[PDB]
């Protein structure tokens, strides 16, 4: 499941939008973007795979490593702590286009 990083490169993240160049099944490269906001939630300090507008309570979203997304999110105590999530869990590349599965 996911692992889009095996056939995609030059991945970048700005705010909640993931943008990356992926290879097509029939050869050739395709570029696309998808809003992860509809699939990431903030649970008492940690980002989880569920819709809830996480960026509304999180800031400094940035790309970490090859497939990890690092950000800071508010805990119930109203404090920003370091949080992270593996994009490889559900973000896959189907025909050069990214699709959550």
- Residue-wise DSSP of 10-31: EEEEETTEEEEEEE-TTSSEEE
What's the maximum distance between 2 C-alpha atoms anywhere in the chain? 50
CA distance 29 to 26: 9
CA distance 7 to 94: 10
DSSP code at position 61: E
**Where do the domains of the chain lie?**
1-101
Whether residue 27 contacts residue 93, with contact meaning beta carbons closer than 8 Å, is answered with no
CA distance 47 to 72: 9
CA distance 76 to 11: 32
CA distance 87 to 85: 6
CATH number of 1-101: 2.30.60.10
- Method in brief: NMR
CA distance 98 to 96: 7
CA-based radius of gyration for the chain: 14
CA distance 36 to 27: 26
């Amino acid at each position: 499941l996911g692992k889009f990083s095996q056939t995609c490169y030059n991945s970048a993240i700005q705010g909640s939008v993931l943008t990356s160049t992926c290879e097509r099944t029939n050869g050739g490269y395709n570029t696309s973007s998808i809003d992860l906001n509809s699939v990431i939630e903030n649970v008492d300090g940690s980002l989880k795979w569920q819709p809830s507008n996480f960026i509304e309570t999180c800031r400094n979203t940035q790309l970490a490593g090859s497939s990890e997304l690092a950000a800071e999110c508010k805990t119930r105590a109203q404090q920003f702590v370091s949080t992270k999530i593996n994009l490889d869990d559900h973000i896959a590349n189907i025909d050069g286009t990214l699709k959550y599965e």
